[PDB]
RNA sequence: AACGAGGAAUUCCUAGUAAGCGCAAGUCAUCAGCUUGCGUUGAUUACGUCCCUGCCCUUCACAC
């Protein structure tokens, strides 16, 4: 069985590169990473780590601050880019953040052959603290999934930012190391250590 | 201070603690606050139910975990033997009892406790 | 581990003015500041008198 | 037949500062240090020198003794562990001003001179070397938690707490982590100064201990534990 | 809906045109013999075809997929599709 | 091991501390069993929480 | 120090590894498996690094009584690794096993 | 006369005017091929319509887009909105309406900004 | 000599907002030791709670 919808080869008077046509075939992040195979390992984080809608570039110019929970629908990569720009000197520079994330995904694919988006989602799943404390002394409370996603993104970005503040390393490379380590589950990542400390102090006052 | 629901949970723990104690005491044979107030455990819990304002009553009941709902049902069952209390506060018991059952009906039916089945049967009739 | 000594001025006073190695440089700074303080006061009094 | 390191020249250990958070360390927080300044020239308020003034201020003179804080600083910085570059000292003044002590510093021995430094530090917010190449004493921003190593065990010194062997406690503790001891330089009072930060509290001996001796006793155990010698 | 027209060829191909502009949109190729009937349900979702080879194909017109195939014993001569009840009768050669 | 519990109701008028919400959650493994817990972040119905300990019952936090 | 750079991009430095205090004469990528790097040093140990984990070698092969300046990976046998030292011996190792002793 | 349609796209002060006519797949922006639009990082943004509906639809038309005002990003969004609106308008006017519906469905499924202007009008609260 | 992002305390802030960037105008009061407009890039975190701190209000059916 075959169904044919094109009977004439499509040649456009304006030349279009072959990569753009293979992008016609399927939507891929930066035309290099496919969203088809990415899945959130933890069931709870599903519906708050949004990867179902493939996008070409992180820039979307959407409205996500209007309602309480719109941030969930926002693509996770774009939220990572947004969290990447902080500390004032970088405020207002989204194109630089997009470039940094592009480079970082390239680095992640280089060092480990896995799909970089999969590594990003694994890191965001792993660094989410599952139990926290509140001041009364302290007392233990559970954490909502949205707060887990927010704090995971913040911890990864802040750890990567601090690691390369006064080091030869550039933001992209240290962020790549942070994401790879967090997805692995190793202690070496700043975010994993902070998450473990939060859960331990919560367990102490449980 | 303690809020509605929290007061009711405290009252249920006290009154049903003694109701369990006496029944176990009678079964084997075959506290300060209540003595100070000079009220039977049925009245003390029933008294606490009256003080809760109706606007806060439904919100107070939802706060209770299930484990107190089983306590609540036994309290109603204990009140049943006292016909004087029942007809005194019949509308209040009926409204509260139905709201409890409706709210957590799914979790109630799942339980296989045979004693619970007998209590509701007695509370029904 | 390498060891150093702290640098400090005994009987420090923050309200007091930082000691300057050069006397001419210190003295002129005293004279300049008196000019700014004195100039600001004189202008303020003249403006009030004119009003 | 493991081959030797290529270069055997003695090499100075790194100076360990707040910026570096991965390296293993033993941190001492001399809690509730009594260091305050006031005009007579400004002077570090002292328990015995200034009784008349402190009565006017209304704070009780019993808790106005920086000599304890000076004393703990002296013993810690001359301990071999600091000479091994595995120790960094933090001080929390009673008022709530947090001071970072670079391990390199060499505080003057006499208590009189030490008072001279503190007033400058509390007022100039930083102290500079004689050769002017790093900042030795620097004030920094509360809370203490952020500056501490990211993966770190926190403990306090409580007389009522169970007695433990400092050597035994350190070895059983993990490696990549680091240890903070919150010691009360205060003369006398409840051991709740660091309860907000700490997770559990321990005692080094059944017998009561001065702030200085306790710090010396604890740091030495790490030296045996970490083979600092 | 009156938007599409299906043409069944004697060589086994089903061509789908658009009535408004008369432009070809899709071509389905399952039967090898002549297609003797084509029908589409009221919802414009499931499409069914029959051919002299005796097979009845079931298509999803929206997704352009082969839902299933049914072989009858004899060649099929004609088709009538009832849209209200989703039943269609086939006049077999036997 | 960690359990997963889906929120079914966000309780109101609980008198909890600011920023802490009392909720009622039913376990995914057993839909019947329900437990009342304290949640720190923004929480709404039908979202899932990771419970480290499934025994403790929530108490008002003031 | 062993460094890994993006070929054709001299400015960027992906990964920097301090394999040993002695000189590291040989740094060869594994032909079958991309992610693993082998470095032979004058320390006489041919550590087998991994790109993802740069802090500790995945394996450390030893047994060479002199400088190791030659390293080769046998095609079709990813586990096997061959190192030749100035001792005059060509040592073969099995990374699948515990290793550190030539087969 | 040659069949032609005109549409506008607007983002902040950036305005794009798109003329779509029967042709041979010649897409231009400011007198240059669409491939040369800058910044390159956002180039795929402008490509988003062309890839969503497939290049075959464009193979029969020429699109000329003139952009003025605003910055880089606003101009990119103006261009993409203008291209999408022009294509849908042309399919409406000179092709079947079913294709128009398919195009609108695809674009609104992906990003409705491609068709509706995004106007962040102030709301006092 | 001074300095390497600035202690304690304290103030402000919820979407084209915070923050960054420049270009114009000087409009009878103010402003150039500057003021006001204009466009460009553009986020994180809350959008619940009355637990704390203040301010405020109360004591024509059916059903309650």
From Swiss-Prot, chain B:
Q: What are the subcellular locations of this protein?
A: Nucleus, Nucleolus
Q: Which domain of life is it from?
A: Eukaryota
Q: What else is known?
A: Present with 9620 molecules/cell in log phase SD medium.
Functional note: Involved in nucleolar processing of pre-18S ribosomal RNA.
Q: Which family does it belong to?
A: Belongs to the WD repeat WDR3/UTP12 family.
Q: How does it assemble?
A: Interacts with snoRNA U3. Interacts with MPP10. Component of the ribosomal small subunit (SSU) processome composed of at least 40 protein subunits and snoRNA U3.
Put simply, this protein is called: U3 small nucleolar RNA-associated protein 12
Curated annotation (Swiss-Prot), chain D:
State what changing residue 106 to A does.
Answer: Loss of substrate rRNA binding
Result after altering residue 191 to R: Almost complete loss of SAM binding. No effect on growth and ribosome biogenesis
Query: Major location, coarse class?
Result: nucleus
Pfam families documented for this protein:
EMG1
Catalytic activities: pseudouridine(1191) in yeast 18S rRNA + S-adenosyl-L-methionine = N(1)-methylpseudouridine(1191) in yeast 18S rRNA + S-adenosyl-L-homocysteine + H(+)
A single GO molecular-function term is: rRNA (pseudouridine) methyltransferase activity
So where does S-adenosyl-L-methionine get bound?
157, 184, 189-191, 204-209
Ranges that cross the membrane: none
Provide the protein's localization: Nucleus, Nucleolus
Q: What does the UniProt entry list as the effect of changing residue 109 to A?
A: Loss of substrate rRNA binding
UniProt keywords (A-Z) are:
Methyltransferase, Nucleus, Ribonucleoprotein, Ribosome biogenesis, RNA-binding, rRNA processing, rRNA-binding, S-adenosyl-L-methionine, Transferase
- The broad enzyme category this protein falls into is transferase
What does the UniProt record report as the effect of altering residue 113 to A in this chain? Loss of substrate rRNA binding
The record, for PANTHER family, names:
NEP1/MRA1 (PTHR12636), RIBOSOMAL RNA SMALL SUBUNIT METHYLTRANSFERASE NEP1 (PTHR12636:SF5)
Family membership: Belongs to the class IV-like SAM-binding methyltransferase superfamily. RNA methyltransferase NEP1 family.
Summarize subunit and interaction data from the UniProt record for this chain: Homodimer. Interacts with snoRNA U3. Interacts with NOP14 and MPP10. Component of the ribosomal small subunit (SSU) processome composed of at least 40 protein subunits and snoRNA U3.
Output this protein's name: Ribosomal RNA small subunit methyltransferase NEP1
Say which species the protein is native to: Saccharomyces cerevisiae (strain ATCC 204508 / S288c)
Quick one: which gene encodes this?
Answer: EMG1
Swiss-Prot record, chain F:
Which keywords label this protein? Acetylation, Cytoplasm, Ribonucleoprotein, Ribosomal protein
Q: How is it modified after translation?
A: N-terminally acetylated by acetyltransferase NatB.
Q: Which residues form the signal peptide?
A: none
Query: GO molecular function of the protein, one example?
Result: structural constituent of ribosome
Subcellular location(s) of the protein: Cytoplasm
The record, for SUPFAM superfamilies, names: Nucleic acid-binding proteins
Record's GO cellular component terms: cytosol; cytosolic small ribosomal subunit
Q: Does the keyword Transmembrane apply?
A: no
Q: Is Acetylation there in the keyword field?
A: yes
Q: Which domain of life is it from?
A: Eukaryota
Into which family does the record put it?
Belongs to the eukaryotic ribosomal protein eS28 family.
Q: How does it assemble?
A: Component of the small ribosomal subunit (SSU). Mature yeast ribosomes consist of a small (40S) and a large (60S) subunit. The 40S small subunit contains 1 molecule of ribosomal RNA (18S rRNA) and 33 different proteins (encoded by 57 genes). The large 60S subunit contains 3 rRNA molecules (25S, 5.8S and 5S rRNA) and 46 different proteins (encoded by 81 genes).
Q: What else is noted?
A: Present with 94500 molecules/cell in log phase SD medium. There are 2 genes for eS28 in yeast.
Which protein is depicted?
Small ribosomal subunit protein eS28A
Organism classification: Eukaryota, Fungi, Dikarya, Ascomycota, Saccharomycotina
From Swiss-Prot, chain G:
Portion of the full sequence shown: 104 to 206 of 513
- Location of the protein in the cell: Nucleus, Nucleolus
Organism source for this protein? Saccharomyces cerevisiae (strain ATCC 204508 / S288c) (Baker's yeast)
Could you tell me what this protein does?
Involved in nucleolar processing of pre-18S ribosomal RNA. Required for optimal pre-ribosomal RNA transcription by RNA polymerase I together with a subset of U3 proteins required for transcription (t-UTPs).
| Start-end of each WD repeat | 21-59, 63-103
Q: What else is known?
A: Present with 358 molecules/cell in log phase SD medium.
The domain of life is Eukaryota
Q: Provide the assembly information.
A: Interacts with snoRNA U3. Interacts with MPP10. Component of the ribosomal small subunit (SSU) processome composed of at least 40 protein subunits and snoRNA U3. In the absence of snoRNA3, forms a complex with other t-UTPs. This complex can associate with pre-18S ribosomal RNAs.
Q: What is the name of the protein in this document?
A: U3 small nucleolar RNA-associated protein 15
Q: What is the lineage of its organism?
A: Eukaryota, Fungi, Dikarya, Ascomycota, Saccharomycotina
């Amino acid at each position: 069985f075959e169904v044919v919808e094109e009977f004439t080869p499509v040649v456009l008077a304006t030349p279009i590169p072959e990569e753009v046509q293979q992008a016609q075939t399927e939507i891929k992040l930066f035309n290099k990473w496919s969203f088809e195979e990415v899945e959130v390992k933890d069931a709870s984080l599903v519906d708050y780590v949004q990867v179902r809608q493939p996008i070409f570039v992180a820039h979307t110019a959407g409205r996500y601050a209007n309602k309480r929970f719109r941030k969930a629908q926002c693509p996770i990569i774009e939220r990572l880019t947004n969290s990447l720009m902080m500390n004032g000197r970088n405020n207002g520079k989204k194109l630089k953040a997009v470039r940094i994330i592009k480079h970082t995904l390239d680095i992640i694919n280089v060092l480990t052959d896995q799909n970089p988006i999969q590594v990003v989602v694994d890191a965001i799943t792993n660094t989410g603290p599952r139990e926290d404390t509140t001041r009364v002394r302290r007392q233990a409370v559970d954490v909502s999934p949205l707060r887990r996603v927010n704090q995971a993104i913040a911890l990864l970005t802040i750890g990567a930012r601090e690691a390369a503040f006064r080091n030869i390393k550039t933001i992209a490379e240290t962020l790549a190391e942070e994401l790879i380590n967090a997805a692995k589950g190793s202690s070496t990542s700043y975010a994993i250590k902070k998450k473990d400390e939060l859960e331990r102090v919560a367990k102490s006052n449980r | 201070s303690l809020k509605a629901g929290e007061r009711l949970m405290e009252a249920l723990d006290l009154g049903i603690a003694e109701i369990e104690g006496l029944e176990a005491y009678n079964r084997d044979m075959k506290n300060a606050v209540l003595i100070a107030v000079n009220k039977t455990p049925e009245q003390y819990i029933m008294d606490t139910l009256l003080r809760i304002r109706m606007s806060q009553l439904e919100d107070a009941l939802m706060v209770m975990p299930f484990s107190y709902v089983l306590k609540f049902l036994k309290f109603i069952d204990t009140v049943m033997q006292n016909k004087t209390l029942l007809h005194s506060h019949l509308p209040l018991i009926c409204k509260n009892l139905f709201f409890i059952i409706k709210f957590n009906h799914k979790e109630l039916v799942s339980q296989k406790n045979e004693e619970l089945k007998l209590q509701i049967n007695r509370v029904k009739t | 581990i390498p060891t150093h000594a702290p640098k400090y001025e005994e009987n420090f006073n923050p309200d007091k003015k930082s000691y300057d190695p050069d006397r001419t440089r210190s003295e002129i700074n005293k004279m300049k500041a008196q000019l700014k303080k004195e100039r600001k006061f004189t202008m303020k009094e003249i403006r009030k008198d004119a009003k | 037949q493991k081959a030797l390191p290529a270069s055997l020249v003695p090499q100075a250990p790194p100076v360990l500062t707040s910026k570096d958070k991965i390296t293993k360390r033993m941190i001492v927080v001399l809690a509730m240090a009594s260091l305050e300044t006031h005009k007579i020239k400004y002077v570090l308020l002292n328990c015995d020198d200034h009784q008349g003034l402190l009565k006017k201020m209304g704070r009780d003179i019993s808790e106005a003794r920086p000599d304890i804080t000076h004393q703990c600083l002296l013993t810690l910085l001359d301990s071999p562990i600091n000479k091994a570059g595995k120790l960094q000292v933090y001080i929390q003044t009673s008022r709530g001003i947090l001071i970072e002590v670079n391990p390199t510093v060499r505080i003057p021995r006499t208590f009189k001179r030490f008072s001279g430094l503190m007033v400058q530090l509390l007022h100039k917010l930083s102290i500079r070397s004689v050769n002017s190449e790093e900042k030795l004493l620097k004030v920094i921003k509360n809370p203490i938690t952020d500056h501490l190593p990211t993966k770190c065990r926190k403990v306090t010194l409580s007389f009522d707490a169970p007695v433990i062997r400092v050597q035994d406690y350190i070895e059983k503790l993990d490696d990549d982590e680091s240890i903070c001891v919150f010691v009360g330089a205060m003369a006398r009072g409840k051991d709740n100064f660091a309860d907000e930060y700490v997770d559990e509290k321990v005692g080094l001996s059944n017998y009561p201990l001065s702030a200085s001796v306790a710090c010396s006793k604890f740091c030495h155990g790490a030296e045996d534990a970490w083979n600092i010698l | 809906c009156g938007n599409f027209g299906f043409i069944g060829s004697s060589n086994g191909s089903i061509t789908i045109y658009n009535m408004q502009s008369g432009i070809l949109r899709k071509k389905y190729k399952l039967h090898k013999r002549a297609v003797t009937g084509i029908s589409l349900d009221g919802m414009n979702r499931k499409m069914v075809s029959c051919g002299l080879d005796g097979i009845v194909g079931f298509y999803d017109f929206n997704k352009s997929t082969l839902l299933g195939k049914l072989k009858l014993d004899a060649p099929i001569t004609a088709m009538v599709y009832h849209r209200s009840s989703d039943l269609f009768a086939l006049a077999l050669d036997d | 091991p960690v359990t997963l519990a889906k929120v079914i109701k966000v309780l109101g008028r609980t008198g909890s501390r600011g920023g802490v919400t009392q909720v009622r959650v039913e376990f995914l493994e057993d839909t019947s069993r329900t437990i009342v817990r304290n949640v720190k972040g923004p929480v709404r119905e039908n979202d899932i929480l990771v419970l480290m300990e499934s025994e403790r019952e929530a108490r008002r936090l003031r | 120090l062993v460094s890994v750079y993006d070929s054709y991009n001299p400015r960027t430095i992906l990964l920097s590894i301090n394999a040993s205090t002695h000189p590291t004469h040989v740094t060869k990528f594994h032909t079958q498996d991309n992610k693993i790097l082998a470095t032979a040093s004058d320390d006489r140990v041919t550590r087998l690094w991994d790109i993802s984990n740069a802090y500790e070698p995945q394996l450390e092969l030893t047994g060479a009584t002199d400088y190791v300046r030659t390293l080769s990976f046998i095609p079709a046998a990813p586990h096997l690794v061959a190192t030749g030292s100035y001792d005059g011996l060509i040592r073969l190792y099995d990374t699948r096993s515990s290793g550190s002793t030539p087969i | 006369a040659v069949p032609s349609v005109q549409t506008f796209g607007k983002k902040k002060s950036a305005t794009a005017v798109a003329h779509v006519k029967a042709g041979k797949g010649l897409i231009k922006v400011n007198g240059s091929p669409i491939t040369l639009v800058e910044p390159e990082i956002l180039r795929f943004k402008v490509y988003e319509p062309l890839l969503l509906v497939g290049l075959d639809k464009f193979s029969n038309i020429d699109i000329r887009v003139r952009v003025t005002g605003g910055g880089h990003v606003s101009q990119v969004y103006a261009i993409r909105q203008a291209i999408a609106k022009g294509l849908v308008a042309y399919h409406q006017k000179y092709v079947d309406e079913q294709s128009k519906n398919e195009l609108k469905k695809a674009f609104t499924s992906y990003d409705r900004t491609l068709l509706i202007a995004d106007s962040r009008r102030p709301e006092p609260k």
